[PDB]
DNA sequence: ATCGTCAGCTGTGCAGTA
RNA sequence: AUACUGCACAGCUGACGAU
């Protein structure tokens, strides 16, 4: 048997004044977000120490003015940072303001520091910052994103030598702000810091140098304060509407109970693309990552009132990825669901992260990005690999390829939606790294469960993204 | 004259050595004295108006100056460095040797404070050709600006799939019998006869392909309702419960095949063999069509700090799993390592070794461990013999040759 | 209620990406 | 917890077989 393969170019982003590049940073660098500020501010707050409080102003201030990357080996993979002055890549200034000045207790900490109970030192560090963000939201001090960037202090006595996480219930409790937040670990803010791991504890975690860490943090920052997003996939022209739906899993705070996920975006009619959750809950039923019929259509029925109250028109073509076996347990009620609202084109693939098969070429380097091969309808896809922009290899082994198993229910052919999921793998608003593996709406869908398995019951979820990354 | 029409031979031809490939050329007006003819960029003949100035030299025959099997050096003039300079484009020099129709170019990247002029052109690594011209294309983008990449430029590469077409047997024997396997194995662990399994017990039925009767497997089977079939009116099902059984008769065939030297392997991960004495192998002769040559199949190595005792015993291993690929059985092959104490338990540590392994490797010694792997392979009951794996034409080549290697 | 074969699912963690 | 990849380990859901 001889099998067909398939190489695919590398995607082109939309930018600013209808631009297009495939590299976020430069088409930030050269064109600026797709959608500009109207404001030229953006305020900032601080929740922590006096020590870290000062180091995060030092971090904003060394970081406005423009820092270099690193050696010279790959400059096409560590872009300098321009900085925020006067040829900004977000064009907006980024200011902290004078009342969000949020500096924590030393007699507080040595309060929860104390380890009878690990739950409940969690729960009382967690419902005190929390309090704190509010009593700072009642004010005339509002800011648009707060950094609350822990210390080495705090934290060493509630996650490492003490089991809850933080970032889970701290997010899930910090909801009803109209303020994201952002967890920033001590060693991005200040460098000369070294902080310990856990199990090797002789051993201890290594980060980027500066910049990296500056350009993701700064396109968080700027996406969580405007709210204007920085990039999108460029649409091709003369195709069809679409819409793009994504359902993961999870298991809950508990020993037997699986509660699913899911996640969701499509186009604006001018320049814009949205991502957002459900305000609702997910329950359970049983513990196969199964999705039974009313769950399916009641997703179908979500994402579809979301797009026509968007664009006044239904779409012409839903596109779905999951990641356990699609069954005709929900599959009927999902094609029902499609049919009773007139959608004429359907895709549905199977996403498999788990194979057992590679590629192997000639040479010391593995196969490129995209390389795509048909084994009679499965469709296994390398979304990581070599690179000829970045000019190497991004890695230290194989890399597990996608296995992409679309349903036999779907419409289009098995080296198409391929290429669409290629070209939506890179629309992560986390960071500004090419090197994606898992599609967008599936990640989207698993920081959504992250999020929401420690969510208590009778809170109201938000839909809004900016809560989530 | 003579060396005047043989330069206008080279010219010409190094056009042609050129224009094999999306590399357009064009030449010059009569006075210039100083360039020659300039080369322009195409991808797959699509321009994107990428320019080299070229200037060209050449020879009828002989041995140049200094010239060896793999390297031959040149000597420059001092009046040409100021227009040998760096510029807005690079100028590469080539020169012909007629006899072997060869077109040497070497690397003009930017003259310095040293000013070495010359040449130093090597035979193998410096030569036109079309697979090494990545690097040769590599040379207008500057280190300052960024954005600025060249795509691959044209040729091939045959990559492989890592895969066994194995040789299944035309028959096999269904039979219906007592002695449910709790009884059957102890029945038979107490036996110095042929005691070999390939069979399942499901449903109170025997499932084997090799004779029941002429072996040990006498009493299960009993002398009674036995019977032949051949393999491919039941090779296929509605019930994906009954094509788990045909994977188990498979893993049960393969368990009697695969149990050659120390098999009977209890992870998913099968092929445990090893040695009796010494622990090693040095083995897997790999044949080839050129040379031979042999790896560490089963390797010790001892601890850094106490030198007297073997720290750990390596073996290689995989994983099956029997997908059927539209009605074909092939084997899926996932190597992997194995560290063992001694050859019955699992080792203290030995993971931050492999991952330090894994760290210094590269991806060649993988699809090399998997052809070594396989030329074992291919060598009563059992076949034990298997095919080769496919192999697959890529549109596109990787842009390593332009590269330097990772560490 | 365990046990090989089966194929897969999630949870909770450690290097550095040239 | 600025991202992402690879290794290592342990558990639970549906069609399989027994003393
Ligand atoms: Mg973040």
Redo the contacts with the bound molecule.
């Keep these: 048997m001889t099998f067909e393969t398939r190489i695919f170019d590398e995607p082109e982003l939309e930018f600013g004044d209808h631009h297009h590049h495939q590299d976020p940073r430069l088409g930030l660098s050269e064109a600026g977000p797709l959608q500009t500020f109207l404001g030229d501010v953006i305020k900032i707050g601080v929740v922590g120490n006096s020590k870290t409080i000062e180091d995060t102003r030092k971090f904003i201030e060394t970081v406005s003015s423009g820092v270099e990357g690193?050696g010279e080996?790959?400059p096409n993979?560590?872009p300098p940072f321009p900085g925020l002055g006067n040829q900004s890549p977000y064009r907006c200034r980024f200011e902290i303001e004078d009342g969000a000045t949020a500096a924590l207790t030393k007699s507080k900490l040595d309060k929860i520091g104390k380890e009878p109970d690990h739950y409940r030192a969690v729960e009382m560090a967690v419902d005190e910052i929390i309090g704190e963000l509010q009593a700072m939201d009642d004010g005339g001090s509002r800011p648009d994103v707060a950094i609350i960037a822990?210390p080495v202090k705090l934290?060493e006595r509630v996650?490492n030598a003490k089991?809850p996480?933080?970032?889970?219930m701290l997010?899930a409790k910090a909801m009803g702000l109209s303020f994201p937040?952002?967890?920033?670990?001590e060693?991005?803010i200040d460098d000369k810091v070294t902080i310990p791991?856990?199990?090797?504890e002789s051993?201890?975690?290594?980060?980027?140098?500066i910049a990296?860490?500056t350009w993701?943090?700064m396109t968080?920052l700027y996406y969580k304060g405007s709210g204007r997003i920085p990039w999108r996939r460029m649409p091709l022209e003369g195709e069809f509407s679409a819409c793009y739906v994504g359902i993961?899993?999870?298991?809950e705070?508990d020993?037997?109970q699986?509660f699913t996920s899911a996640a969701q975006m499509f186009d604006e009619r001018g320049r814009g693309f949205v991502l957002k959750g459900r305000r609702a809950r997910t329950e359970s039923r049983?513990?196969?990552?199964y999705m039974a019929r009313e769950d399916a259509k009641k997703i179908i029925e979500d994402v579809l009132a979301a797009y026509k109250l968007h664009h006044k028109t239904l779409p012409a073509r839903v596109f779905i990825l999951k990641?356990?076996?699609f069954k005709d347990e929900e599959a009927d009620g999902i094609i029902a669901a499609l049919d009773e609202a007139g959608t004429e084109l359907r895709d549905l693939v199977?996403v498999?992260?788990?194979?057992?098969a590679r590629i192997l070429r000639d040479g010391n380097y593995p196969v490129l990005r995209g390389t795509f091969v048909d084994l009679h309808g499965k469709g296994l896809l390398y979304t990581?690999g070599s690179m000829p922009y970045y000019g190497?290899?991004?890695?230290?082994?194989?890399?597990?390829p996608l296995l992409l198993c679309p349903h036999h229910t779907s419409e289009s052919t098995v080296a198409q939606l391929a290429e669409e999921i290629f070209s939506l793998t890179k629309v992560?608003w986390?960071?500004t790294?090419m090197?994606?593996?898992?599609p967008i709406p599936i990640?989207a869908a698993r920081k959504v469960?992250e999020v929401l398995?420690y969510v208590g019951e009778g809170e109201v979820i938000s839909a809004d993204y900016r809560k989530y990354? | 004259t003579a060396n005047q029409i043989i330069g206008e031979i080279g010219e010409n031809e190094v056009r042609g050595r050129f224009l094999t490939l999306g590399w357009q050329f064009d030449g010059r007006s009569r006075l210039e004295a100083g360039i020659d003819g300039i080369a322009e960029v195409m991808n797959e003949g699509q321009p994107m108006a990428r320019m080299i100035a070229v200037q060209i030299k050449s020879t009828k025959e002989g041995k140049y100056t200094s010239e060896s099997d793999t390297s031959f050096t040149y000597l420059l003039r001092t009046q040409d460095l100021a227009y040998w300079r760096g510029s807005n484009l690079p100028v590469i020099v080539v020169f012909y040797r007629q006899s072997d129709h060869s077109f040497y170019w070497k690397e003009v990247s930017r003259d310095a404070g040293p000013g070495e002029r010359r040449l130093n052109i090597d035979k193998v690594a410096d030569l036109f050709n079309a697979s090494t011209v990545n690097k040769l294309a590599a040379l207008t983008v500057p280190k300052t600006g960024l954005g600025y990449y060249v795509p691959p430029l044209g040729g091939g590469e045959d990559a492989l799939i890592n895969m066994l077409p194995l040789t299944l047997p035309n028959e096999m024997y269904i039979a219906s019998t007592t002695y449910?396997?709790?009884?059957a194995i102890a029945v038979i662990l107490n036996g110095d006869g042929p005691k070999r399994f390939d069979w399942?017990?499901?449903?109170?039925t025997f499932w084997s392909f090799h004779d029941p009767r002429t072996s040990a497997c006498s009493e299960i089977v009993d002398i009674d309702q036995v019977e032949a079939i051949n393999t491919k009116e039941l090779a296929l099902h509605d019930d994906?419960?009954e094509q788990?059984?045909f994977?188990?008769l498979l893993?049960?065939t393969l368990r009697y095949q695969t149990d050659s030297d120390l098999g009977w392997?209890?992870?998913?991960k099968?092929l445990y063999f090893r040695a009796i004495e010494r622990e090693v192998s040095r083995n897997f002769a790999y044949t080839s069509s050129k040379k031979k040559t042999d790896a560490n199949v089963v390797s010790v190595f001892k601890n850094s700090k106490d030198e007297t005792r073997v720290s750990f015993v390596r073996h290689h291993a995989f994983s099956?799993?029997?997908?059927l690929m539209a009605d074909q059985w092939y084997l899926i092959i996932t190597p992997?390592?194995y560290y063992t104490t001694n050859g019955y338990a699992?080792h203290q540590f030995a993971?931050p070794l492999?991952?330090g392994k894994?760290?210094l490797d590269k991806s060649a010694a993988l699809r090399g461990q998997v052809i070594m792997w396989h030329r074992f392979l291919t060598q009563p009951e059992a076949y034990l013999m298997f095919g080769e794996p496919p192999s697959i034409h890529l549109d596109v080549r990787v842009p390593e040759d332009g590269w330097?290697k990772?560490?």
């Design positions: 690193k080996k790959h993979m560590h822990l934290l996650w089991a996480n933080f970032r889970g997010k937040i952002q967890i920033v670990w060693d991005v791991q856990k199990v090797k051993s201890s975690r290594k980060i980027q140098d990296g860490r993701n943090l968080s993961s899993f999870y298991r705070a020993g037997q699986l049983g513990r196969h990552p990641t356990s076996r199977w498999q992260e788990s194979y057992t990581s190497t290899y991004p890695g230290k082994y194989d890399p597990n992560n986390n960071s790294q090197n994606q593996r898992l990640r469960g398995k990354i | 449910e396997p709790r009884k399942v017990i499901n449903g109170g994906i419960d788990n059984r994977s188990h893993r049960q392997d209890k992870d998913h099968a099956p799993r029997f997908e992997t390592y699992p993971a492999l991952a894994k760290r330097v990772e560490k």
